[PDB]
Design a protein around this ligand. Structure first.
Ligand SMILES: OC[C@H]1O[C@@H](O[C@H]2[C@H](O)[C@@H](O)[C@H](O[C@H]3[C@H](O)[C@@H](O)[C@H](O)O[C@@H]3CO)O[C@@H]2CO)[C@H](O)[C@@H](O)[C@@H]1O
Length: 94
């Protein structure tokens, strides 16, 4: 079914560590999606995928260095979720 989009905001200048996204979902599910943002007038996507563990938790990490400096916002997208999946929270962490 339908893609789920979550607007995010980050530092435009701090590129230390990892964009860290926590999802809660059906235990043992498969899921995938992206982080999407505009840079230089163009839409760019960094894909993620992962399975929820036995507790229904999924942590996705994307290194910050993959996102150009000067980008401060975009969308976390869920594309495929075998069961249920929600994004509970995100931040840049080291
Ligand atoms: O095929 C993968 C999935 O694609 C989903 O569509 C998303 C596109 O992949 C994504 O590029 C597009 O991005 C938008 C963004 O949401 C918007 O704010 C910006 O203004 O423009 C971008 C488009 O250039 O978002 C869509 C989600 O709406 C499908 O919905 C999904 O079924 C499919 O698996």
């Amino acid at each position: 079914d339908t893609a789920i989009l979550y607007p995010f905001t980050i530092s435009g200048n701090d590129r230390n560590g990892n964009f860290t996204i926590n999802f809660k979902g059906t235990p043992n599910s498969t899921n995938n999606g992206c982080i999407g943002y505009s840079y230089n007038g163009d839409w760019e996507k960094i894909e993620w995928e992962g399975s929820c563990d036995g507790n229904g938790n999924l942590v996705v990490e994307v290194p910050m260095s993959k996102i150009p400096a000067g980008v401060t916002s975009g969308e976390i997208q869920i594309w495929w979720h075998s069961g249920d999946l929600k994004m509970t929270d995100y931040k840049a962490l080291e």
